[PDB]
Amino acid sequence: VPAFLSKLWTLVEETHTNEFITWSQNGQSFLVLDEQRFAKEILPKYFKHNNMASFVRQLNMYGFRKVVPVEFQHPYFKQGQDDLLENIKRKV
Amino acid sequence: VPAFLSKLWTLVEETHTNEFITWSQNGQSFLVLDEQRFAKEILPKYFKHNNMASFVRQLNMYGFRKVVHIDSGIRDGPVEFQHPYFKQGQDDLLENIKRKVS
Amino acid sequence: HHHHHHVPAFLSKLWTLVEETHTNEFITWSQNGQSFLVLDEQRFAKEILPKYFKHNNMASFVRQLNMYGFRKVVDGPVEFQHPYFKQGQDDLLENIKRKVS
DNA sequence: TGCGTTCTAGAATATTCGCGG
DNA sequence: ACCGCGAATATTCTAGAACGC
Ligand code: NA
Ligand code: NA
Ligand code: NA
């Protein structure tokens, strides 16, 4: 599993980040509750940038889609099912 | 068991090196906690060099893989390596680790 | 503060690192201007690299050097050379090419 | 024939920028 | 500003290759 996916799983799963990024209620998507604080305070703790656009570029590269707080989903990104991450293949 | 693996086992297992190189908390991988001091103060006591890169090349020659460190963005952090046959309390598995041949 | 806008960031930053005097404690031209020296690989990687790049790994700095065609000149300084990386000849930087595998 | 050290390269992922809309 | 996406470069991790023993 590439670093982006395992870090993203950790971010969403960990409760100590839940003020800015968390599973949706049913566990099928994740929410960014405060984009600006997420990008300025959380992104540089796990990635080499503080740029929401570079996070979103990676979401696109891994096939995530925005859901109509911002919400993203991937069929193989589900609460309690980290074994499924191996199914997610980055775009070339 | 070639010298690299027995020396690596002793390095990880020994408590007195644990500031530099230690089992991870699950015992399925090992950590190098201070890469610079490990390379300059530990490596040349066990090997003919003081270069982390030459240690790392050997780790990969023996089939070890680097573990992603989750909380690494932006006092250097740990580096973690794992091998299915390098496990705390299971030194009987070391004989199964065969170096790649060039 | 690097400033060679016409070449990739790595070469512009490398030129500034070598040329600027306040970094000469870490990285500087060799005496004849034909190569550059990293004087203390440990201090350079920990104190200088993350001020200019998104990492503090000598190996990733060296990967870039080789990718742009630099060769190591074979404890102490490490020395790297490129025919087109030369003191007083910044017009040659744009002849340095990034290798493609 | 195999192991150790060094230097360089392959390939994948990661970050940024810019384009058209 | 967004949004999807191509492209250039950066960074990481592993491997190739030369050479000594
Ligand atoms: Na969370
Ligand atoms: Na130890
Ligand atoms: Na300098």
Author numbering:
A (entry chain C): 7 to 74, 88 to 111
B (entry chain B): 7 to 80, 85 to 112
C (entry chain A): 1 to 74, 86 to 112
Paper text:
Here, we present co-crystal structures of human HSF1 and HSF2 trimers bound to DNA, which reveal a triangular arrangement of the three DNA-binding domains (DBDs) with protein-protein interactions largely mediated by the wing domain.
The structure refined at 1.75 Å reveals an HSF2 trimer bound to the three nGAAn repeats in unambiguous electron density. The DNA in the crystal was packed in a head-to-tail manner, where the 5′-overhung adenine in one strand formed a standard Watson-Crick base pair with the 5′-overhung thymine in the complementary strand from a neighboring asymmetric unit. In this structure, an HSF2 trimer binds to a tripartite HSE motif with one-to-one occupancy between the DBDs and the nGAAn repeats. All DBDs sit on one-half of DNA and are spatially arranged like an equilateral triangle seen from the top. Exceptionally, the side chain of Arg109 close to the C terminus in DBD II deeply inserts into the major groove and engages in a direct hydrogen bond with the purine preceding TTC. This arginine in the other two DBDs, however, contacts two neighboring nucleobases by bifurcated solvent-mediated hydrogen bonds (S4C and, S4D). Likewise, the wing domain in HSF2 DBD I, albeit not entirely visible in electron density, is engaged in a similar hydrogen bond network with DBD III. In the HSF2 trimer-binding structure, however, obvious bending is observed at the 5′-proximal TTC triplet bound by DBD I rather than the downstream purine-pyrimidine base pair, while the DNA at the other two binding sites remains a relatively linear shape.
